[PDB]
């Protein structure tokens, strides 16, 4: 229990209804750290997280994690629903976690721009 997800990547373009792979990177940490899961969201590219605290957009997946390489890469399956309108979006990964002796829990967010094609 001493590694955390530190970043997320994904293809620049995806086809709706067709699964693709998102990559999650991890690194070692001194404090105890638990990655519980990752919610996958598809958001408008203009999303304002200050006005919409915690927002990830439309939920398109959830990955339970609680396997994961402590200091490397893991691939995760993600699908944009077939009915999604084409265009530019933000793909948002919301990683739930616990850290430390006090058990601080929360979400870390990672995003990338993706083009959703028919």
Ligand X SMILES: *[C@@H]1O[C@H](CO)[C@@H](O)[C@H](O)[C@H]1NC(C)=O
Q: List interacting residues with ligand X (CB under 6 A).
A: 7, 9, 25, 47, 49, 72-73, 90, 109, 111
- DSSP letter (8 states) at residue 72: S
Site string for a second copy, 54-83 (x = CB under 8 A): xxxxxx--x-x-x-----------------
The closest of 96, 73, 87 to 10, measured between CA atoms, is: 73
Residue 96 binds a second copy (CB under 8 A): yes
Contacts of 14 (CB under 8 A, 6+ apart): 20, 80, 114, 115, 116, 117
Please say which residue, 36 or 109, places its beta carbon nearer to ligand X. Answer: 109
CA distance 97 to 86: 32
Residues at the site binding a second copy, with contacts judged by CB under 8 A? 32, 34, 36-37, 39, 41, 43, 52-59, 62, 64, 66, 92, 94, 96, 98, 101-107
């Amino acid at each position: 229990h001493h590694h955390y997800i530190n970043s997320m990547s994904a293809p620049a373009s995806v086809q709706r209804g067709q699964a693709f792979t998102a990559q999650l990177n991890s690194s070692i940490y001194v404090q105890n750290y638990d990655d519980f899961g990752v919610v996958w969201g598809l958001a408008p590219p203009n999303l304002n997280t200050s006005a919409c605290v915690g927002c990830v957009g439309r939920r398109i997946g959830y990955t339970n994690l609680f396997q994961v390489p402590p200091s490397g890469t893991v691939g995760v399956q993600v699908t944009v629903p077939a009915d999604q309108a084409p265009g530019e979006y933000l793909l948002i990964a919301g990683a739930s976690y616990l850290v430390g002796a006090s058990g601080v829990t929360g979400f870390n967010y990672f995003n990338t721009t993706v083009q959703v094609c028919e």
